[PDB]
Amino acid sequence: PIVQNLQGQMVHQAISPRTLNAWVKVVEEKAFSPEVIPMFSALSEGATPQDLNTMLNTVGGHQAAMQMLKETINEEAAEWDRLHPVHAGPIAPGQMREPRGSDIAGTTSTLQEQIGWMTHNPPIPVGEIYKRWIILGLNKIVRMYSPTSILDIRQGPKEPFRDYVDRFYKTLRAEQASQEVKNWMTETLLVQNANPDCKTILKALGPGATLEEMMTACQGV
Amino acid sequence: PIVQNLQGQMVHQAISPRTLNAWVKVVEEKAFSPEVIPMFSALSEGATPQDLNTMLNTVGGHQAAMQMLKETINEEAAEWDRLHPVHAGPIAPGQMREPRGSDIAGTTSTLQEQIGWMTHNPPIPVGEIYKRWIILGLNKIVRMYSPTSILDIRQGPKEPFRDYVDRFYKTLRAEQASQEVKNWMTETLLVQNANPDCKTILKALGPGATLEEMMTACQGV
Amino acid sequence: PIVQNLQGQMVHQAISPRTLNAWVKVVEEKAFSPEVIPMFSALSEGATPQDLNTMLNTVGGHQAAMQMLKETINEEAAEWDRLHPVHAGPIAPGQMREPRGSDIAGTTSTLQEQIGWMTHNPPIPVGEIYKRWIILGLNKIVRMYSPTSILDIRQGPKEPFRDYVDRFYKTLRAEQASQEVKNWMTETLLVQNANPDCKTILKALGPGATLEEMMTACQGV
Structure with a gap:
């Protein structure tokens, strides 16, 4: 870095x-789980493209x-090259060259070149561009x-609501939709796939209800 | 940080x-237990909002x-914005902008901005404001x-008082009431839910008694 | 009228x-069905409040x-009175009085008064205000x-898709949500509650598919 x-x-x-081994161990233990992305992000703080290929390889x-x-x-690299065309005429002696998708991917650039771009004034954030591609x-x-789909999440006939609500915000945690849609899913789907005994209970709470009150409301069920 | x-x-x-892994491990091991809050507080020493979202994410x-x-x-952020209105007229060239709830939550501010506010003179403690929201x-x-409720804490017929007193100040440890009320709970509820054999013993100690004397008093029971 | x-x-x-009897007969036959609202709307063309109470009564x-x-x-009438306050000072000899919620409901106004407001220049559409309240x-x-809820609409194991799609846009016909949400429901819920044999078929059509092609695609199933 x-x-x-x-x-x-x-x-x-x-x-x-x-640090290397911690990257390895995360991948070993949590495979494709979402916690991998913040984890990655922390361990990629101040990292080069070169270090990012090292981690992937x-x-x-x-x-x-x-x-x-x-x-x-x-x-994403092909798209970088498309969106940002090469610049007019020959490269100045006084200046250093603009990056391509492959320089961002670290492939066509050398380390000293990666340090030139980032340390120079203005600096260019080629890490953060690769980082979005990685996150994407x-x-x-x-x-x-x-x-498993969010519609397939339902409460058992003997399953505590609590264990079901945990399953819901875990699966909701793997949905990437707009917040407004996710609000719609919250008020709607949760109650709908809740079991008849608790469903009955939740209908009595009315609207405006919050999670501690729902969670304490269906506790004996 | x-x-x-x-x-x-x-x-x-x-x-x-x-440090990251120690944060992870605490959460793994002690889940929602109260020791998590001092622990958090120590590991959040000198931390940014950005680092606090990292830890939560x-x-x-x-x-x-x-x-x-x-x-x-x-x-808590909505409340920050409510209580502190935006200031009069345009932002000065010589000055930097006042934060909103979302800058405190780290969302609308950049790191360099988070460093401007904290390092500048006077400094503003946007960490400590988020910290209270986290603690709250x-x-x-x-x-x-x-x-389990504090009223549900009672001494068994064969259970040593000692094991019961431990349970009491653990549950008392999860009550957040004024000290005066918690003093009232101490002198009252402890003896009341104590078993008849020890209860008898404790009545003979009279009032004014302290925990070592109660604890040595009901030892053979 | x-x-x-x-x-x-x-x-x-x-x-x-x-006309009266046709209003009666609609209500007899189709009770609360949605077709009642366009039907109402046609038969209420050029109608007075007085005629609208007659129809309701x-x-x-x-x-x-x-x-x-x-x-x-x-x-809705209480709301009319709230939103539109009474006007400043005494009523002019040269002018006629502004309506209240109860004049719109026909209650406090006479027919000649209802004809004054509508026929006068500018005219005021007290029918159309009551009409929205009726439609609302x-x-x-x-x-x-x-x-029955839209989530409860599902395809049988032996039920033709066709008979299911009819049920879907009938229930979708009783949903009043934004078009974008209803588009989301279309591409999502329809396939999801479709039976495994057709579901399999529909997965092979890919995205971009239209209703005649879905409907001809699951015909042998």
Whole structure:
């Protein structure tokens, strides 16, 4: 990564083995779970493209997903090149070259080049551009690797509501829809797939009800 | 977080992986237990809003609680905006803008902006404002996720008083009432739900008695 | 009603018995069904408040609904009076008085007064104001008197899709939601509650599919 030194300049320092291993261990343990994305984001703080390929290349397993991601990274890169055309005429001696999708992916650029772009004034955030592609591609994966739809979430005849509400906001946690739609899902689908005994109870709370009151309301059921 | 450097200035430094993992592990092990709040408080020393969303977003599990907290954070934020109106006329070139609820929640502000507010003179404690909302919302959770009322705490017919007194100040530990009320609960409810054999014993100690003397008094019972 | 005469003026003429009876017969046959509202609207063309109370008062049966409507008409009328305050000072000799909620409901006004307001220049559409209250109150009734939710609409294991799609846009016909939400319901819920054999078929059509192609696609199933 590129970090600030004591002297007050930005210099490159290598990433740590127990950081590396922590990246490995996350993937081992939580596979495609959503917590992987904030986790990634923290461990990618101040990271280079080069370090980001290192992290992706050091994965073992889940090769269908790893290929889907690659292909997303190239699509997003192809899109970078499309949206940002190359600039007019020859490159100035006094200046350094604009990046392409493949420089952002780290492929066509060298480390010193990656440090030039980020440390220079203005700086360009080629990490953050790759980061969105990674996060976007992470959404693709998460959405695919979900095994059950939100409509299929229902309360058992003997299942406590509580255990059901947990299941609901876990699956709701894997839905990516607008907040307004997710509000609509909350007031609607939760009660609808609730069991008759609690359903009866919840109808008596009326509208305007909040989760602690619903959760304490269906406790004996 | 924003920490003081050797040179004698306040600069941002990233939070550590075994700090991150220690946050994870606390949540894994002690879930909604009260010790989570001092623990949080220590690990949030010198932390940014941005780091606080990172910590909240990196949770797995307990999604009903995570949603209740979110909704508390937005309520407390809505309340920030209500109580503190925007200021008169355009923003000065010489000055930086006042925060809103969403800047405190980290959402509408950038890191450099979060460092401007905290490092500037006077400094504004946007961490400590979010921290209270987190702690307040932590109380909401703790109180909900308690499974048993203080009136339901009683001593068995064969249960040592000692094991009962431990249960009492654990449940008393999850009551948040004024100290005077909690004093009233101490002298009253403890003896009242104590078993007849020890109850008899405790009546002989009279009033003015302290816990070592009660605890040694009902030892053979 | 108030109709235009051959001479080229607006004069009142009475409503016809087989019009009256047609109103009766609609209510007899289709009770609370949605077709009642366009039907009403056509038969209320050029109608007075007085004629509208006549139509409501001549109902037999469905007295719970008739009371709910009354109470909606008074609420909407109370709201008219609230929103439109009485005007400044005494009424001019040269002018006629502004209506209240009860004049719109026909109650405090006389026919000649109802003809003054409508025929005068500018004219005021007191029919159309009552008409919205009637239609609004008709929505309230329709929504209540629906017996089954859209989530409860599902395809049988032996039921032709066709018979199911008919049921869907009938129930969708009793949903009053924004078009965008109703589009969301169309692409989503229809396929989801479709039977496994057809569901399989529909998955092969891919996205972008239209109703004639879905309807011909699941025909042998």
